[PDB]
Amino acid sequence: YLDRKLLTLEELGSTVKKGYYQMKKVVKTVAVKILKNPALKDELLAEANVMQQLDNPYIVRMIGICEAESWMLVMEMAELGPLNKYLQQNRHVKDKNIIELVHQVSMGMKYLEESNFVHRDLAARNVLLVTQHYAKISDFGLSKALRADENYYKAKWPVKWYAPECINYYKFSSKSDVWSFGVLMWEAFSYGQKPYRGMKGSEVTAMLEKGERMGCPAGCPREMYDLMNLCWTYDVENRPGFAAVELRLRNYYYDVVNL
C-alpha cells in the first residue's frame, strides 16, 4: 500500500500515466494504471493480487497499490513499449534479436507455468521492452491462479490468440498460453503484423479446424517456424509446455550466438 504523497504523476494507453515513486533515496520511474469509477474495482484488485505473487525478471513488477483520488496500480516502467509497435517501427532488428526477445518471453512463461498461473492474454501487444534486448510480460487482468488440484481454469476475447479448447470448451491452461505464445512468435517474426489479417474469429476457428495455420514469416528461421507450428498443436495433450518451448528456444538461440 503506497503513499500517495511519495508519488508524482505526469497519458500513454487508455488512465495510464508515467510517474515517479520516491524510494528510500532514489526516485523510480513508474507506469500507473489509474482506474476511473461499478465492480471494476475488484478487477484491478484481482490483477494486483496476481502481480503481487509474481517475481521474475521477464515479468513486469508491481510496485504497489495506491488508494487516493483514484485507485491506482503502480508498476515498473518499460520505456520502449509494446513489442509489436517497436518492431513495426524497427525493421532493422535482426532475427537473432527477435529470437533473444521471444526466448525471454518463454522464460517468463516457464516461470508462470511453474507458479501455476494462466495469463490468458499472451500477445505481442502485451510484451513490453525495457531495452531492445530485454522484454517483460505485462497485462495480467485476465490472469488466473490455478487451484492446487486442477491444471485448467474454466470460464471480450482475443480469439486469434486462443487455442481450440478455449473456444470449444472454455478451458484455459498453460498449454493454452503455449498456443498464444505461438501466435506471439509469428507476430514478432512478422515485425508486429496482425495475425489472421482481415478474418473474423469464427473464420479463424474454421481455418484452424481444417488444420490450416499461418505461413512462415519472411526471413523467419525455419526452426522457429517449426516451433510455432508445434505451439499450434490442436490436441492439448500433445501440445508442448513452456519447459519444452523454452528449452528448444534456448538451445537454438545459443546455436545462433555461438556461430
Swiss-Prot record:
The chain holds residues 364 to 635 of 635 of the full protein. This is Tyrosine-protein kinase SYK. Coiled coil: none annotated. Residues 8-254 form the Protein kinase domain. The active site is at 121 (proton acceptor). The modification Phosphothreonine is found at residues 15, 205. Widely expressed in hematopoietic cells (at protein level). Expressed in neutrophils (at protein level). Within the B-cell compartment, expressed from pro- and pre-B cells to plasma cells. Non-receptor tyrosine kinase which mediates signal transduction downstream of a variety of transmembrane receptors including classical immunoreceptors like the B-cell receptor (BCR). Regulates several biological processes including innate and adaptive immunity, cell adhesion, osteoclast maturation, platelet activation and vascular development. Assembles into signaling complexes with activated receptors at the plasma membrane via interaction between its SH2 domains and the receptor tyrosine-phosphorylated ITAM domains. ATP binds at residue 33. Ubiquitinated by CBLB after BCR activation; which promotes proteasomal degradation. The SH2 domains mediate the interaction of SYK with the phosphorylated ITAM domains of transmembrane proteins. Some proteins like CLEC1B have a partial ITAM domain (also called hemITAM) containing a single YxxL motif. The interaction with SYK requires CLEC1B homodimerization. Changing residue 173 to F: In IMD82; constitutively active protein tyrosine kinase activity. Interacts with LYN; phosphorylates SYK. Interacts with RHOH (phosphorylated); regulates mast cells activation. Interacts with NFAM1 (phosphorylated); probably involved in BCR signaling. Interacts with VAV1 (via SH2 domain); phosphorylates VAV1 upon BCR activation. Interacts with GAB2 (phosphorylated); probably involved in IgE Fc receptor signaling. Interacts (via its SH2 domains) with CD79A (via its phosphorylated ITAM domain); the interaction stimulates SYK autophosphorylation and activation. Interacts with FCRL3. (Microbial infection) Interacts with Epstein-Barr virus LMP2A. It is linked to Immunodeficiency 82 with systemic inflammation: An autosomal dominant immunologic disorder with onset in early childhood. It is characterized by recurrent infections with various organisms, and multi-organ inflammation that manifests as colitis, hepatitis, arthritis and dermatitis. Patients have a propensity for the development of lymphoma, usually in adulthood. Disease severity is variable.
